[PDB]
């Protein structure tokens, strides 16, 4: 059969130019008289139609997105790309390139949606802080310890405990936007209180876009 | 200015029949073809029906669509609801050289309440050496996933620098949440104690930390 694969960076800064390219494998763009369209979908919102293209210069855009969408077809590389201008923070949506044959019909084959998040400031490294358990941090026969992942950009961050050895009781929480741009989250694991001073727990926070791997040991609080 | 009006939330028990509407404002539904898209969360949409009455090869017969051009509302009838049918439903049109989608329907069909275990940690010395401080309050293993957080500085409530996370489903069917209080190192030692209070189903679970 045929398939659609999108490319391009998953980040864009406000008031910049977006460059997302969708490539086709297993078929021909010019043959079959097959249209091509781009469809975006914000998280938690409905699908939004951006525009559609033919293998020739025929094109059409949504009236809300008019005079901002620039889509071109390059037959030689067998792919088509979409350029967006004056991107804002409200443009955060999952972009799907949609192989569709009938203009009033359906997008029979859907490509996988790439996540686009308007990048703020710049890609910055995370600040990992230990989360020391104590007598007030335990309720019963079990205790909770973790690691704080604060002030990083962009999403996502992968946190593993003891290089993936500890998985039971490990909770990874979704990120939340801080008061000024940056993100913050944490990852914690619940362990019995008997293994506090006898077992070593090391969190492994990885931030691929900033190329930073931080291993932080978690120990009980030392009162000073 | 042609839009497709769809119900936001439609919930019924499995095994029964439901009707999902798609209403056009200006243009008639019989003017253009109507395409219904059924999409998993975190997955590409798949067309559950097109051409307003004919079912694609691969979907079951239960996905039936009908057109009522008198009321300008397009209907999609689903019978015998199952687990995999819990997804978003979108209806599509064409207008005039401008593809218009629908609002989106939350097809829906149930867990024992769980107590919100709450733990607290003080800011670390390494963070203090970085001229920063953050108090982390965490809520876990609770149901229903509706909790309210309120930081306390000894007795005064704290609102500035408070960042909290929406409840998220855990592996054991319960919910998990977090709360973060960004703070200065001088303000951390200014007050005698800092406490985070979690209210869930009327009951309140409180823990406190102090600079030690």
Dist. CA A62–CA B94, nearest whole Å: 11
Nearest to B26 by CA among B93, B119, B97, B84: B93
Looking at CA atoms only, how far is residue A179 from chain B in angstroms? 7
Torsion sign, CA atoms B68, B71, B74, B78 = negative
Q: Classify each residue of B119-153 as buried b or exposed e, where b means 16 or more C-beta atoms within 10 Å of its C-beta.
A: bbbbbbeebbeeebbbbbbbbbbbbebebebbbbb
**Contact between residue A99 and residue A125 where contact means Cβ atoms under 8 Å apart:** no
DSSP string, B54-106: B--BTB-TT-EEEEETTTTEEEEEEES--STT-SEEEEEE-TTTS-EEB--EE
**Contact between residue A131 and residue A117 where contact means Cβ atoms under 8 Å apart:** no
Helices (H) and strands (E) in chain B, counts: 2, 19
End-to-end CA distance of chain B: 64
Q: Which residues of B touch A111 (CB under 8 A)?
A: 44
Q: What is the CA radius of gyration of chain A?
A: 23
Question: What kind of experiment solved this structure?
Answer: cryo-EM
Looking at CA atoms only, how far is residue A31 from chain B in angstroms? 22
Hey, is the C-beta of B2 within 8 angstroms of any chain A C-beta? Answer: no
* A218: phi then psi, degrees, rounded to nearest 5: -110, 125
Nearest to B103 by CA among B92, B95, B111: B92
| Local structure of residue B43 (DSSP, 8 states) | S
**Residue where the block lists tokens 């600040």:** A127
Q: Which residues of A touch B22 (CB under 8 A)?
A: none
Which residues, at least 6 apart from A170, have a Cβ–Cβ distance to it below 8 Å? A161, A187, A188, A189
The alpha carbon of B177 is separated from its chain's Cα centroid by a whole number of angstroms, namely: 14
Dist. CA A95–CA A84, nearest whole Å: 12
Which residues, at least 6 apart from B132, have a Cβ–Cβ distance to it below 8 Å? A127, A150, B123, B182, B185
Dist. CA B146–CA B151, nearest whole Å: 17
Tokens of A8: 């391009």
Which residue of A46, A64, A216 to mutate against B (max B Cβ within 10 Å)? A46
CB contact under 8 A, A132 and B121: yes
Q: Which residues of A touch B101 (CB under 8 A)?
A: 46-49
Dist. CA A117–CA A92, nearest whole Å: 5
Nearest to B116 by CA among B199, B195, B57, B172: B199
SS (H, E, C) chain A: CCEEEECCCCEECCCCEEEEEEEEECCCCCHHHCCEEEEEECCCCCCEEEEEECCCCCEEECCCCCCCEEEEEECCCCEEEEEEECCCHHHCCEEEEEECCCCCCCCCEECCCEECEECCCCCECCEEEEECCCHHHECCCEEEEEEEEEEEECCCCEEEECCCCECCCEEECCCEECCCCCEEEEEEEEEEHHHCCCCCEEEEEEECCCCEEEEEEECCCCCC
Dist. CA A93–CA A114, nearest whole Å: 9
Tokens of A89: 């923070």
In this complex, the residue of A112, A113, A148 whose CB is nearest that of residue B134 is A148
Helix (H) or strand (E) holding B126: helix B125-129
**Residue where the block lists tokens 């406190």:** B208
DSSP string, B147-163: -EEEEEETTEEE-TTEE
In this complex, the residue of B45, B125, B208 whose CB is nearest that of residue A136 is B208
CB contact under 8 A, A221 and B122: yes
Question: What does DSSP say about strands A183-192 and A142-152: parallel, antiparallel, or unpaired?
Answer: antiparallel
Compute CA distances B78 → B62, B85, B87, whole Å: 6, 9, 13
Dist. CA B73–CA B64, nearest whole Å: 15
**Contact between residue B188 and residue B194 where contact means Cβ atoms under 8 Å apart:** yes
Which residues, at least 6 apart from B190, have a Cβ–Cβ distance to it below 8 Å? none
Which residue of A1, A48, A124, A129 to mutate against B (max B Cβ within 10 Å)? A129
Hey, is the C-beta of A224 within 8 angstroms of any chain B C-beta? Answer: yes
Hey, is the C-beta of B211 within 8 angstroms of any chain A C-beta? Answer: no
Which residue of A65, A101, A107, A143 to mutate against B (max B Cβ within 10 Å)? A107
Nearest to A188 by CA among A141, A139, A131, A134: A131
């Amino acid at each position: 059969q045929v398939q659609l694969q999108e490319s391009g960076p998953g980040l864009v800064k406000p008031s910049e130019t977006l460059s997302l390219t969708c490539t086709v494998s297993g078929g021909s763009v010019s043959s079959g008289g097959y249209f091509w369209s781009w469809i975006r979908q914000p998280p938690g919102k409905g699908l939004e139609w951006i525009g559609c293209i033919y293998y020739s210069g025929s094109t059409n855009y949504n009236p809300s997105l008019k005079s901002r969408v620039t889509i071109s077809v390059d037959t030689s590389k067998d792919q088509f790309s979409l350029k967006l201008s004056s991107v804002t923070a409200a443009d955060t949506a999952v972009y799907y390139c949609a192989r569709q044959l009938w203009l009033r019909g359906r997008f029979d084959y859907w490509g996988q949606g790439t996540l686009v998040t308007v990048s703020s400031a710049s890609t910055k490294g995370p600040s990992v802080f230990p989360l020391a358990p104590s007598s007030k941090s335990t309720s019963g026969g079990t205790a909770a310890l973790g690691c704080l992942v604060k002030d990083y950009f962009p999403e996502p961050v992968t946190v593993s405990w003891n290089s993936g050895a500890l998985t039971s009781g490990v909770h990874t929480f979704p990120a939340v936007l801080q008061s000024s741009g940056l993100y913050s989250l944490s990852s914690v694991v619940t362990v019995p209180s008997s293994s506090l001073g006898t077992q070593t727990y090391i969190c492994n926070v990885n931030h691929k876009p900033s190329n930073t791997k931080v291993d932080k040991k978690v120990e009980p609080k030392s009162c000073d | 200015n042609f839009m497709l009006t769809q119900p936001h939330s439609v919930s019924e028990s499995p095994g029964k029949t439901v009707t999902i509407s798609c209403t056009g404002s200006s243009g008639s539904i019989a003017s253009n073809y109507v395409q219904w898209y059924q999409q998993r969360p975190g997955s590409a949409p798949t067309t559950v029906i097109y051409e307003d009455n004919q079912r694609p090869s691969g979907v079951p017969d239960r996905f039936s669509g009908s057109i009522d051009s008198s009321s300008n509302s397009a209907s999609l009838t689903i019978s015998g609801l199952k687990t995999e049918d819990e997804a978003d439903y979108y209806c599509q049109s064409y207008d005039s050289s401008n593809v218009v989608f629908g609002g989106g329907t939350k097809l829906t069909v149930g867990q024992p309440k769980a107590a919100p275990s709450v733990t607290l940690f003080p800011p670390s010395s390494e963070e203090l050496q970085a001229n920063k401080a953050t108090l982390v309050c965490l809520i876990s293993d609770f149901y229903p996933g509706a909790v309210t957080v309120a930081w306390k500085a000894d007795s005064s409530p704290v609102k500035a620098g408070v960042e909290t996370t929406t409840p998220s489903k855990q592996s054991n069917n319960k919910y998990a949440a977090s709360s973060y209080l960004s703070l200065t190192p001088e303000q951390w030692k200014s007050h005698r104690s800092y406490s985070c209070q979690v209210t869930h189903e009327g009951s309140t679970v409180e823990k406190t930390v102090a600079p030690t």
